[PDB]
Each structure stands twice: as structure tokens, then as C-alpha cells.
Design a protein around this nucleic acid. Structure first.
Ligand SMILES: [Cl-]
Ligand SMILES: [Cl-]
Ligand SMILES: [K+]
Ligand SMILES: [Mg+2]
Ligand SMILES: [Mg+2]
Ligand SMILES: [Mg+2]
Ligand SMILES: [Mg+2]
Ligand SMILES: [Mg+2]
Ligand SMILES: [Mg+2]
Ligand SMILES: [Mg+2]
Ligand SMILES: [Mg+2]
Ligand SMILES: [Mg+2]
Ligand SMILES: [Mg+2]
Ligand SMILES: [Mg+2]
Ligand SMILES: [Mg+2]
Ligand SMILES: [Mg+2]
Ligand SMILES: [Mg+2]
Ligand SMILES: [Mg+2]
Ligand SMILES: [Mg+2]
Ligand SMILES: [Mg+2]
Ligand SMILES: [Mg+2]
Ligand SMILES: [Mg+2]
Ligand SMILES: [Mg+2]
Ligand SMILES: [Mg+2]
Ligand SMILES: [Mg+2]
Ligand SMILES: [Mg+2]
Ligand SMILES: [Mg+2]
Ligand SMILES: [Mg+2]
Ligand SMILES: [Mg+2]
Ligand SMILES: [Mg+2]
Ligand SMILES: [Mg+2]
Ligand SMILES: [Mg+2]
Ligand SMILES: [Mg+2]
Ligand SMILES: [Mg+2]
Ligand code: NA
Ligand code: NA
Ligand code: NA
Ligand code: NA
Ligand code: NA
Ligand code: NA
Ligand code: NA
Ligand code: NA
Ligand code: NA
Ligand code: NA
Ligand code: NA
Ligand code: NA
Ligand code: NA
Ligand code: NA
Ligand code: NA
Ligand code: NA
Ligand code: NA
Ligand code: NA
Ligand code: NA
Ligand code: NA
Lengths: 132, 53, 337
RNA sequence: GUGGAAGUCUGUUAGAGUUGGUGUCCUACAAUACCCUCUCGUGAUCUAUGUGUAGGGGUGAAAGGCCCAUCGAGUCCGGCA
RNA sequence: GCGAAAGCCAAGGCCUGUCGGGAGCAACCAACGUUAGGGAAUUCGGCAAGUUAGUCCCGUACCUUCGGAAGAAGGGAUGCC
RNA sequence: GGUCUUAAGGUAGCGUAGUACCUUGCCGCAUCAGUAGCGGCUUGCAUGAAUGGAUUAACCAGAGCUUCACUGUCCCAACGUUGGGCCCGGUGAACUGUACAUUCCAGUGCGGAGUCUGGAGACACCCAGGGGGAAGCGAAGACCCUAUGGA
RNA sequence: CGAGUGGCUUGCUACCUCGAUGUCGGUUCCCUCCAUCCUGCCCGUGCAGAAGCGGGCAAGGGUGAGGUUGUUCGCCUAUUAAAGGAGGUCGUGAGCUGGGUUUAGACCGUCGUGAGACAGGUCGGCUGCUAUCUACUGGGUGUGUAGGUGUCUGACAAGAACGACCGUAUAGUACGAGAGGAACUACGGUUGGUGGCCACUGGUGUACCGGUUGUUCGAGAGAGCACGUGCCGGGUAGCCACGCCACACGGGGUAAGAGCUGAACGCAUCUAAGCUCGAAACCCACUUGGAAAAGAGACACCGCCGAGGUCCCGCGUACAAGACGCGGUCGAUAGACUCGGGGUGUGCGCGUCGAGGUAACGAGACGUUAAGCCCACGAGCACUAACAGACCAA
């Protein structure tokens, strides 16, 4: 994929529970896999900012629950390094549900989003309220 | 840049920016300040802080 | 099933034993392209700081923008090519033929060498030119040494001596170029060989760690879960299968770790100056204050502060040189705190 | 409200017991130990001393458990070379 | 302090749970502290460790032999002057 | 089958059971995914009434499973603390030992060799280490068979 | 239907061990095989393209994470370039685990008159040893080559030191009715592996500083203990990874394969002689070790009555002993002192305020005070200590 323009320390793993920063009706998401990723023996597949991960809905509307969908990680508590050397970290871990084309399944995104996520998922960015 | 906490100048190529839930932003020059903040203390009440000074 | 997995650690830097010389010895030299010139230089490690640079990369979507880069400050005062050694090609590879020395010696070179009191430079030079006439002359190198006394932060006065090859146009031309440098007094500087922005290979003896276990030395796992409480924590499962009934040298075992020679490739030279512009407030920890000829190397360099490190024009660069990068800021913030 | 029952509860009170750690030990401190954890702790309770039951016999809330480091028949000597 | 509890301290006893000296004292081992982000993915199994915790007020489900379940759960308070 | 063996021929119940071979039975719950667990079905290889059946509040260092919380169990390891370890003075055993012995790769051999054969490698001594081999040490195999053995 | 190869399964045999070669499964750690799952290079296609199917060379590298089950196997999920199979005493218990098989306790079903049994199920049920030899990882002492210092050489040895993927331009292009949809090349990034490093972020930090509970030293001040910090908050150096830096291309020779010239055989023929190309594979390149390479090396200088070295003293860029490296008055090597640079967070005392209280008393607030306390770093500085001196040596 395109360079994020920032170094990331994956702060998530297969099985992690994260916030669904949109109005799709899914509140909590459980990470299942990381797109294009292959680890190594004993290593828990890891995911962080800007990765497209497969997920399952743990909390939310009955119809949304248990569904296996795709999403993009928009925020993480673990720091990331920007070109100027500064580190950036968020208050929580969050992802936004996406479709085949990478267009947000929802209509509105809740909470801020990392600028680096723009250089990868345009339609997700062009739906952001706040882009830090 | 200036540390949104203590007030001293943040040495370039240094520090962390914490993004609040609401979207607000806070640049810290060090762990000492971040930690003092997480304790719920306000820089104005800490005598070593440039702010307070 | 037993999932596959790469072995622990590389088998290419062994045996993992203590280095014979604290002063590195390059086992390769650049190719004879440009004009004649010494193919290396040396300095003493001091510490690290960062610098803000202007994105120099023509292919970077950020070219032209600010950018923080880690740098290792290395004091690179002038050295002295005290002699020109000549090699001859033979059925058994190259062998030293003769050497051309000078008379002007640094006050304390006798702390290491039995300085020459009687030498015949011309005879040596003759023997070399004859060799060249016959076409048996192998490459040409210069016996070089440092002047630790010019570096206060470094305790030693005893100079470090090493041989550096001379690559140049024709053999005749560079042979002459060699003699010229030597005859003077051999005094040369980082400037004469490198230009900020070029890529160099830095060799050096890593920081010693004495004896260490397989976990640290080779990267093997620690015993996991219940196994970690049985009496074994940092020991590998076994030294091998029943057969072959012997322990193979390839199994990760305890031993000397650190204090090995390493030649780290393609290190970009961010800047070459002189003064105290790169020094840190309070002084470089466990080193001292810098105020003289220095070189800023991008990233890290093998070895601890004060150790001698060697420079050589990259022998296998990936990128083209992008000379004199713009440095907008050099941090002098204390390294304590 | 009084009263203060209980093979009642909590409890390293004393005291009794011995679940997990399959830790330490495993030519031991120890021929059954050490530490942490854990169970009971007014009752069919725990305990000292005295006293009774003896080997195809005792004793046994029964595991073939126990009867002096000895038990699907103790120990000693003899039958016996 | 509820306390024959902990912790600290008297009286009284001891430095005899009886080999010492040296190295910032490496690997490795025994006990153990702290570990960012993730949070059982480890494993036969959450084994080990951790969490909770004292007291007062509020409040407390299914089920039930009406005794109980129950300290259910959950919420709040707690110092000094 | 619409009596026959041998007296009767399984009733209330429970049921894939700590009893179900086929078996990961089928359906459902739950999970991304559940040979597990729970519920229903159930023709039960080979359930069933004091050989007690069903069921059950309370109790339990009893067996299995799920959730919240928690966390170095794990991702993936780091640093530190104390006692050892290492060097020095003093004290001072044991296990084990046919002999020889610096081995390695192959082969051979009673078919699982440091010692045979062919090659390869190999200057001696010493320190620390984790235990690959000596079918390592420890125990006249508990398994199995045999004995005109024992209990 | 016919001929075989392997020695992973199962069966057969009874050669080896019953004065014992510790079980299954798992784990950890090392090497290997190819009948190739991915990756490279190719051939055919029912090959338009894209996506495939089948085949050849090829073992360099990769082949991962999870839910049920002790399981091996296998079923299932989401990722993936792909999530290949097999050998090493079914590799690996003087390494671990101990869930299963298969001790002694018990239950159920079936069988038996019964003791008790089961190629049925189930709960519980132990893991010994101080390494003599050998082997290897690392470290020393000697001898050989035959005085010393410094610098090299390179017989050989090791490496995967690099493997792989995604994205952009190419290009909505070639191809195609359309749907759909490449490539060469050049770029950016990711992942796995590898080596090093600590400016940055992060961890530790029983150095240090502060807060505070209980108790003891009468109070205050200042302290001990509470497990080897009472607890809580912050945290320098160092060490570290979760942090950062670096890790080609290109030549040479080949395989499969594509061809050239070309004869046997006037033609034809990639082959018989000759030649041009062509794989992640091979060699070189690059990194590491390497004068004990018995052909036991080379060069320069110093020295054979003196070159150099060991011991000694102050120390670490080094370190388990040993080794290594630096400094030694012609000196900044270590300590003191003073600065600098850092960590805490505002000291004792005194003054004012303070809910109140006759008063006594009074938690606490402000000032003095970026104070007080502290530092494993740097500089200045010969004040202290690197003194004295011993020895070996052609
Ligand atoms: Cl995955
Ligand atoms: Cl393990
Ligand atoms: K046997
Ligand atoms: Mg695993
Ligand atoms: Mg800082
Ligand atoms: Mg154990
Ligand atoms: Mg620092
Ligand atoms: Mg009771
Ligand atoms: Mg009790
Ligand atoms: Mg009695
Ligand atoms: Mg019995
Ligand atoms: Mg953590
Ligand atoms: Mg699991
Ligand atoms: Mg697992
Ligand atoms: Mg437990
Ligand atoms: Mg069922
Ligand atoms: Mg009846
Ligand atoms: Mg032989
Ligand atoms: Mg026998
Ligand atoms: Mg038997
Ligand atoms: Mg009998
Ligand atoms: Mg054995
Ligand atoms: Mg093949
Ligand atoms: Mg291979
Ligand atoms: Mg085996
Ligand atoms: Mg195996
Ligand atoms: Mg073994
Ligand atoms: Mg064993
Ligand atoms: Mg042992
Ligand atoms: Mg078992
Ligand atoms: Mg079991
Ligand atoms: Mg069992
Ligand atoms: Mg000899
Ligand atoms: Mg204490
Ligand atoms: Na043990
Ligand atoms: Na242990
Ligand atoms: Na074995
Ligand atoms: Na009453
Ligand atoms: Na116990
Ligand atoms: Na008897
Ligand atoms: Na007798
Ligand atoms: Na019956
Ligand atoms: Na009981
Ligand atoms: Na820990
Ligand atoms: Na062994
Ligand atoms: Na035997
Ligand atoms: Na096994
Ligand atoms: Na391969
Ligand atoms: Na499985
Ligand atoms: Na075996
Ligand atoms: Na064992
Ligand atoms: Na085993
Ligand atoms: Na090639
Ligand atoms: Na030699």
C-alpha cells in the first residue's frame, strides 16, 4: 500500500476489542485478521493505525452483531512517529467499518482521525469531522 | 513549539502529542509533564512550571 | 505438525569470538574509478544527537520539507599517512614488496612503533618502480595513524595504526599521488576524502558484553508458561538430536558476545565540519566536549564512545550521492534528562 | 425488643488437617523435609498421661488401612546347610 | 485494633537457625519487584500470578426443604484539624 | 408373530448418560471458528426403580463449561533486588572406574561401533558452560512368557 | 493389465536388548531429503486478456495465527505469495510438560455363581543423579615455526544476509463485442530474517527527591523498622525494544528451455564436434574468522647489552579466573573541591494568615525559597593518589 508517512508500533492484536468510530450500529469490534499480513511462529498477528483489518461485531444492534466485516484502524493508544520526530497517541483504539471499495459503511465518523489515514483511505478521510 | 503543560519550549524533534477523545490536542515536552497531568494536577499549581512562574 | 521458523541468529558473523584488533581492518576497498585518492579515514566516536534536515530525496513526496534525523557525532581530526606500502602479485596472492617512509613524525608515534631512524626512501621507491616496470605491482596502500592527542575526550595518546588502500587513475599516476602525500608529512583530513552527502561504510569493534546466554546472544526464546517455573528459564530445549551423536556448532550456545568487528554499510555522511556546533549541553555522557574536526554520521555506528571507527567510501551503494544536505537545526540539548 | 440455639458462619487465637504449586529438596536439614496456597477450628472436636485388645490374631467411619522406617498375614530365633 | 491478628516496641534473651575474604558481582539458577500497547492469543486446563479486600449507609435476582440463597449483585462513604 | 427359551418380557421415570459401539449422532444455543459445554430429539451396541428410579434447596481444597473483572500465561521480552554461581583462605566427602581412549563421516559386524575397515580430521595442557553421545549413572524388568515356583 | 521405486503406514518374521536402550502427544533447538505448496526461470493449453489448469528445471528462502480434541490425524475460521510433505532411536524426558495409554482408590455399563474381567467409558493418582570420557560454544597457558615492535598476506572456513508482498506511474493502456483488464521499467512502502545502536519514544532504574500510614527514639527537628523499597508519586546514568540505523546491483558458468551454425543421412535437424542465450539454484562479488597453512607466510623499522616485554601503581572503550585496552609527573588516569549539565518539587527556622477556642491550643495557607536535598555525566583544577622499584630478555 501507500506509505502512511509515519512509523507505527502496532498496538493491537488478533482478538483485541476496539471502538467502532462510526454510526453503523456496531459499537464494539473484535479484531480477527490484518490484511496482507503474515507473522512468524508464536507471534500474535498485529495491527495498528492505517491497517485494513477483518473484524467481527461484538456489541451493537442485533442485526450488526456477529457479522464479520472489514474495517480500517483510525486511532490507537500506542504512539506513532511522525517525520518531524514527534510522537502521536490517542485516547482510545478505534476503527471504522469499510466495504469492498473502502467506502465507510456508515454516514458519520465519531471522534478524531489520524491525518496519515487520509493518504490511504480517501473516502474515509473525506468523511471525517476532525483530522489531527 | 511550547509545551501545553509546563510552558517551556519543546526541543524540536522531541515530545509527544496526545489526542483527546473530543479531538482536542495536547503537546507534551516530556513524560514528567504527561504524568503530572494524568495525576489530575494543573501546571499552574506546580511551582517548577514556567506556567506557574 | 511443528510450524517452520528461521534459525536463531545469523551464522555469518562467526565464530562469535573476541576481536583480535580493537582497530578495525577492512577486508574490501572501493573500485579504482575517479582520480587517485586515499580510500578511507578514521575518527573517535563521541555520542548522538539529532538534526533537522531538508528532505533531499528527489523521489520523496516530502522532498523539500523539514525532517528529524538521528546522528552519531564522530571526532575526525587530521590523520597522517606515514608511509606508502607496495604489494606485488604472486602465485600466492599479494605480498608486501617494500615501503617508503618519511622523517617527520608525530611526537608520540613512538608509543606504538619503533620509529625509523635510518631508512632509504629512494631505494624503496626504485624497487617499486622496477616492479611496476615488470608489471608485478599489486595495489598501493598507505600506512596511516591517528592523533588521539588532538582529541581531549579520549584518554589515549598512543596512536592507532592502520593501512588504507589508495585507488586512483593509473597505477603510475596514483603511485606518484601516494608518494606526494607521504613525503610531505602525510597530513590529511576527512575533507580530502569525503564530501558531506556521500555514503560511507563504517567499520568498528562493537561494545563488549562479556559472556552472555543464548537468549541475548542468539535470540532464542525463554522457556514459556509452566516450563519457565520448572527450573529452566533461559536455556534451550536441547543440544541436538540423538544422531548425529555430537553437538553441532550451529546450535545457539553461551559465549562471548560483543567486542566483534562489524562493517556497517551505506552510512550517509550528513555533515563534515569543525568546532563545537554539534556538542551537547553538559557534555556527551561518558565522553566529553566536542570542539574540533567532526563528522556527523546518519544513524548509529558500531562500538562505544571513545572507540576508533573507520570510514571508507561505500563499496556497494544503493542510492546516488546527494551532496551537502541542508541542515536547518542541530540539537545541543543535554543528553542527561 | 429480649434471649443466645447450632456436628452454623468468618477466623495462620491455640490446636488439628493436608488441596494446588506437580515449586525448593531429591549422595536432602529430613529413609516423607522447607516455603507459599489451602481445609477444620463447641464438636462424631483436638490433646497428655495411664490403661486394654497380639499375629491367621488384634484394630479398621473399609484404603487390604494400621499393629515401633517391617503388613494380601509383624518381629526375633529356631526347623535350616 | 474486633482481637491471644499484623506491624512496631519494652522486660527478658540472643548476634550459635555458627565458616570467612573479594569482584557493579558476567552466563546460568533459586526466591522476588516493576514492565509500554494488547488482555488467556498461553495451556489438557487461567497451572502460576493477579484482581477484590477492613467498617458504615443504601440496595440485593433465580431458586428454596421458608432455615436459606446473601457479604448475592450493584452504588456511596472513609484522613486530619 | 397379530407365542418360544426359561418364571416374567421393562411399568413411573430417565436417556448419545461418569451407562451410547456406530460418534465429532441430528437440530438449536454460543464463538470468526466450539470432537467441549448446555437444551431438545433419542429406536437405549449394553438405561430403570432400596443391585433403588427420578429429582432436589443447602453444603464442597470433588468433575466439565460460560461471562464480567484481572493480569508478564502469551505476543516478547527488559531492567532491577537478595542468596548462590566466579576468584581467594580454611575444611573436605560421594557416585563411578575390564582396558585403551583427540575424534568425525561412511561401511561392516549378533541387524543400534571412540576401539573392526576405508577415508577425513587431529600440537599439548587448563578455565567456564549448557547437557548431543558413551544404546551415560542408578535397580539381576514391574510389562510378556517359561518353572510339574510362592502367596 | 503389465513393470517398478521408496521404507512415512499396516501386516509378517522373531535377528538384537528382559543383571531395563524411559511411553504417546506437545514443546524447545539443530541438521537434512524432494516425490515442489509459494517464490525464480521455463513448456503445453480446450493459451484473446485477466484468472486458471497441467507439465519441466529447481531445495536459496518461506510455508504463519486461531476454535473443538490428550490426541497424532483430522474438522472448522479469518488472514496469506503459499500457509507442501518427509527423515534424523516414529530426532529431541542425564531439556521441559505429564493431558492420554498402563500400577495401587472409586463409579457406571456389559460378562461371571464368585474372586474378578473388559482391545468399554469415567474421576484421582510421583518424573532420581554433584559430568570421568567424548562433542560443541566461548576463554586462557604452553610448545613448534626460530630477538622485538607495528602493519599485512590468505590456504581454507561460515553466511540467507537477505527472502517475500502491497501500492503508484506505466494505464483504465495492450487484449477484448463488452464485461473486464495485463507487462517491461522506474519508484514509495510493508512484512519475515539479519547485524548494530540509545539523539528520539518507551520499560527499568530496592541511585536519588517528595508525599504519606503504623510504631519507637518525650515533642519539634532528624531518624530506624514494616523483606530484604512500608506504601504511593516522579525519575538521572546505564542496560534495553515496544525505539532508531544499515543489510545491492552486477559480472561468470549452467539446468529446464529458446535458438544459431552444422554433419552423420547431398535434404532436414538446437547436438554428434562448435556457438549464442537462459533459474530465487552454482561461482564471484559483500560480511565474519583465519600464520599451527609442518611449503608453519610477507614487509618496514628497532634491537642482540640491550629493543622490547612481564611484575608494579592509577584506571576501564575490557572482563566469571586468565585475557584485553589506556594512563603513569615530559601526567588530566582516579578521587577531593568548584563550575557546567541533570533528578525531585519549594527545606529548617522565623514572620503573617488560619475554622475556631477565655485561654491553652490549632490541621493547614502565604512569604522568605526555581528553595532544600541529591547525581553512576562533563569541564576546570596537580590539592591527594599514579610513588618506590623489581624482573626477563637474543
Ligand atoms: Cl490472522
Ligand atoms: Cl518452553
Ligand atoms: K527388554
Ligand atoms: Mg505455538
Ligand atoms: Mg526530554
Ligand atoms: Mg517440574
Ligand atoms: Mg539521556
Ligand atoms: Mg463449624
Ligand atoms: Mg474457620
Ligand atoms: Mg492412650
Ligand atoms: Mg483393593
Ligand atoms: Mg503490560
Ligand atoms: Mg486457547
Ligand atoms: Mg495454542
Ligand atoms: Mg490458582
Ligand atoms: Mg446432547
Ligand atoms: Mg423392586
Ligand atoms: Mg581409522
Ligand atoms: Mg531379571
Ligand atoms: Mg502380571
Ligand atoms: Mg498358589
Ligand atoms: Mg539412555
Ligand atoms: Mg525434481
Ligand atoms: Mg537448505
Ligand atoms: Mg522419538
Ligand atoms: Mg520432528
Ligand atoms: Mg535426551
Ligand atoms: Mg528424566
Ligand atoms: Mg540431571
Ligand atoms: Mg496423566
Ligand atoms: Mg483426564
Ligand atoms: Mg486420568
Ligand atoms: Mg614436536
Ligand atoms: Mg527497609
Ligand atoms: Na528443577
Ligand atoms: Na523453579
Ligand atoms: Na534420549
Ligand atoms: Na424472638
Ligand atoms: Na501442604
Ligand atoms: Na502371621
Ligand atoms: Na531358619
Ligand atoms: Na436392570
Ligand atoms: Na469436607
Ligand atoms: Na515478572
Ligand atoms: Na551429554
Ligand atoms: Na542389559
Ligand atoms: Na514427545
Ligand atoms: Na526451496
Ligand atoms: Na486444532
Ligand atoms: Na529411543
Ligand atoms: Na522426566
Ligand atoms: Na516426552
Ligand atoms: Na546467471
Ligand atoms: Na607462524
Amino acid at each position: 500500500m501507500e506509505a502512511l508517512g509515519a512509523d507505527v508500533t502496532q498496538g493491537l492484536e488478533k482478538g483485541s476489542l476496539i471502538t467502532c468510530a462510526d454510526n453503523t450500529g456496531a459499537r464494539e469490534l473484535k479484531v480477527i485478521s490484518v490484511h496482507g499480513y503474515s507473522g512468524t511462529k508464536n507471534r500474535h498477528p498485529k495491527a495498528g493505525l492505517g491497517d485494513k483489518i477483518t473484524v467481527s461485531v461484538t456489541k451493537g444492534t442485533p442485526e450488526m452483531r456477529r457479522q464479520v466485516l472489514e474495517a480500517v484502524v483510525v486511532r490507537q493508544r500506542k504512539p506513532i512517529r511522525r517525520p518531524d520526530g514527534t510522537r502521536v497517541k490517542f485516547e482510545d483504539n478505534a476503527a471504522v467499518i469499510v466495504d469492498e471499495n473502502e467506502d465507510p459503511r456508515g454516514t458519520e465518523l465519531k471522534g478524531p482521525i489520524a491525518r496519515e489515514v487520509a493518504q490511504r483511505f480517501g473516502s474515509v478521510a473525506s468523511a471525517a469531522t476532525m483530522i489531527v | 513549539r511550547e509545551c501545553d503543560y509546563c510552558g517551556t519550549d519543546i526541543e524540536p524533534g522531541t515530545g509527544t502529542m496526545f489526542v483527546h477523545k473530543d479531538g482536542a490536542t495536547t503537546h507534551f515536552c516530556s513524560s514528567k509533564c504527561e504524568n503530572n497531568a494524568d495525576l489530575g494536577r494543573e501546571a499552574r499549581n506546580l511551582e517548577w512550571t514556567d506556567t506557574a512562574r | 505438525p511443528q510450524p517452520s521458523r528461521p534459525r536463531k541468529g545469523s551464522l555469518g558473523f562467526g565464530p562469535r569470538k573476541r576481536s583480535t584488533s580493537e582497530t578495525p581492518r577492512f577486508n574490501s576497498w572501493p573500485s579504482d574509478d575517479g582520480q587517485p585518492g586515499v580510500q578511507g579515514f578514521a575518527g573517535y566516536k563521541a555520542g548522538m544527537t539529532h538534526v533537522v534536515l531538508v528532505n533531499d530525496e528527489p523521489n520523496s513526496p516530502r522532498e523539500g520539507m523539514e525532517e528529524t534525523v538521528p546522528v552519531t557525532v564522530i571526532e575526525t581530526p587530521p590523520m597522517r599517512a606515514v608511509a606508502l606500502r607496495a604489494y606485488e602479485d604472486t602465485p600466492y596472492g599479494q605480498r608486501p614488496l617494500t615501503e617508503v617512509w618519511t622523517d617527520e613524525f608525530h611526537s608520540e608515534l613512538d608509543r606504538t612503533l619503533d620509529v625509523p631512524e635510518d631508512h632509504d626512501p629512494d631505494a624503496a621507491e626504485e624497487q617499486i618502480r622496477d616492479a611496476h616496470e615488470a608489471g608485478d605491482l599489486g595495489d598501493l596502500r598507505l600506512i596511516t595513524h591517528t592523533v588521539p592527542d588532538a582529541v581531549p575526550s579520549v584518554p589515549k595518546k598512543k596512536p592507532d595504526v592502520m593501512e588504507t588502500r589508495v585507488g586512483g587513475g593509473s597505477v603510475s599516476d596514483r603511485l606518484d599521488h601516494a608518494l606526494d602525500i607521504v613525503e610531505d608529512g602525510g597530513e590529511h583530513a576527512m575533507n580530502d576524502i569525503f564530501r558531506a552527502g556521500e555514503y560511507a561504510d563504517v567499520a568498528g569493534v562493537t561494545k563488549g558484553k562479556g559472556t552472555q546466554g543464548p537468549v541475548k546472544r542468539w535470540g532464542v526464546q525463554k522457556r514459556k508458561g509452566k516450563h519457565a517455573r520448572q527450573g529452566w528459564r533461559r536455556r534451550i530445549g536441547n543440544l541436538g538430536p540423538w544422531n548425529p551423536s555430537r553437538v553441532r556448532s550451529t546450535v545457539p550456545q553461551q559465549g562471548q558476545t560483543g567486542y566483534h568487528q562489524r562493517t556497517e554499510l551505506n552510512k550517509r555522511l550528513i555533515d563534515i565540519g569543525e568546532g563545537d556546533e554539534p556538542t551537547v549541553d553538559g557534555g556527551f555522557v561518558n565522553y566529553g566536549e566536542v570542539d574540533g574536526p567532526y563528522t556527523l554520521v546518519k544513524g548509529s555506528v558500531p562500538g562505544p564512545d571513545k572507540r576508533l571507527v573507520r570510514f571508507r567510501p561505500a563499496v556497494r551503494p544503493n542510492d546516488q550521492p546527494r551532496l551537502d544536505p541542508e541542515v536547518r537545526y542541530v540539537s545541543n540539548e543535554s543528553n542527561q534528562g
